Amino acid sequence: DSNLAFKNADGYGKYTQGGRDGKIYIVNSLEDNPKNPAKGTLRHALKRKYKRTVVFNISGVIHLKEPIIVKSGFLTIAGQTSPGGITVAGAPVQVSDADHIIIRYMRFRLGTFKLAEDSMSVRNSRDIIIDHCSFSWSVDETASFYNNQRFTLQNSIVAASLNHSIHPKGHHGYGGIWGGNKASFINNVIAHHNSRTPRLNGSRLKPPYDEQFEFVEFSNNIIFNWGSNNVYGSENGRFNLINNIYKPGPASKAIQLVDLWYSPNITKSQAYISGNYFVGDEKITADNRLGVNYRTSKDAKRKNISMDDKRLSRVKLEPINGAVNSATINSTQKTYSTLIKEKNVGANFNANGMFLDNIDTQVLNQVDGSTPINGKGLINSELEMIKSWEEYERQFLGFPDIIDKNKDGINDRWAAKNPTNQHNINAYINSITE
Ligand SMILES: [Ca+2]
């Protein structure tokens, strides 16, 4: 209850500790020096080895010259402390074999620079929760979260991968590879991807736990304007897929809820698939199995799962290991209202209050149909979406400074107004978004 990572944390990573018991680290520069990272920069902060909450007394775009690989856990990245808001560009932040990490109110937008990379990834970790973040403009995949234990991605925008870009192997507009050992993916908007929205990992890619623990819950997400495929994969992995919203856009070719790949080591009750709303297909909506495809063999094509196939479970599945911290599942109607009308998704606060940047705002408005989409809606470059990087950054620079004379990461003016509590960094950070 008070062990929760934060007030509305849910799903299998909801009890992640992050850096709640650590030092405060203030990032006060947008610079990056991969060779000698200076104190006060993101690279230096994330490479520290002690428990830490990283806060931001700076706003705008951090142009990474190289990836940051995060190996040391007990980390909270409190992106909502930034006066106007932080975007990480140029190279990915890659979490690798780490424990207890909370990441909130952060933007990861690779852009078209020198790497054919993801915007962000988390791998081989455990006790991870990512909340209210925005991911976009990748060359490899936008956001990849696989082979982690006790993981939650919630209330995030994963959108607008770069399709025909600079990847060696050709066009490559992919949402991400999602999987884990009890991993929740809930209340997310996944929009404008040629494919992999997400690609469910299954037991693949050198897992550090055995395949009978590969277990994913995917619920209350909105997938919009996928391309040739949407959700697919999950070889020999189980999953619940409940009360998601599927809304074809002008690029969408596959009309399905999932493309289940060949899974010889599971013969019954591999997935539970129910309550999903397919915009513009009343038959899939009324009976979800009409949108479920299965691959008979390693090289078989997509065909409709046969209707009495027991691969599909009658009841919601549960992981076989430990606490079933499954997320609360709401109706598809409430989900649409919350993410698209209330816009309670993505990096939607800074230290000065609510704020959804123009890129995220456009994406949600296009989902809703209140703003038009040019063509298929699958971009090849962020420069179709922004005039220039310098121009995209300006919007984050026009918010009032957060005065922090004593350098404790607490807004001096909030300290003056909360005397009995003025040194409580947790209570200050909660105040920002509550
Ligand atoms: Ca202060």
Author numbering: 25 to 458
From the paper:
Pseudoalteromonas fuliginea sp. PS47 is a recently identified marine bacterium that has extensive enzymatic machinery to metabolize polysaccharides, including a locus that targets pectin-like substrates. This locus contains a gene (locus tag EU509_03255) that encodes a pectin-degrading lyase, called PfPL1, that belongs to polysaccharide lyase family 1 (PL1). Polysaccharide lyase family 1, PL1, is a family of primarily polygalacturonan/pectin lyases that catalyse depolymerization through a β-elimination mechanism, resulting in the formation of a double bond between the C4 and C5 atoms of the sugar residue at the nonreducing end of the polysaccharide chain. PfPL1 is crucial to initiate pectin depolymerization and has demonstrated activity on apiogalacturonan. This enzyme belongs to the largest PL1 subfamily, subfamily 2 (denoted PL1_2), which is one of only two subfamilies with characterized members but no available structures (subfamily 8 is the other).
The 2.2 Å resolution X-ray crystal structure of PfPL1 reveals the compact parallel β-helix fold of the PL1 family. PfPL1 crystallized in space group P212121, with unit-cell parameters a = 48.50, b = 58.13, c = 149.08 Å. Residues 25–458 of the recombinant protein could be modelled and refined with no gaps in the protein backbone. The B factor of the Ca2+ ion is comparable to the average B factor of the protein, indicating that it is relatively well ordered and thus may represent a structural component that pins together these secondary-structure elements at the C-terminus. The VexL structure is a product complex with a trisaccharide of α-1,4-linked N-acetylgalacturonic acid occupying subsites +1 to +3. An overlap of this structure with PfPL1 clearly reveals conservation of the catalytic arginine residues, Arg220 and Arg235, in PfPL1. Taken together, these comparisons suggest a Ca2+-dependent mode of substrate binding for PfPL1 that is similar to PelC but a catalytic mechanism that does not rely on metals.
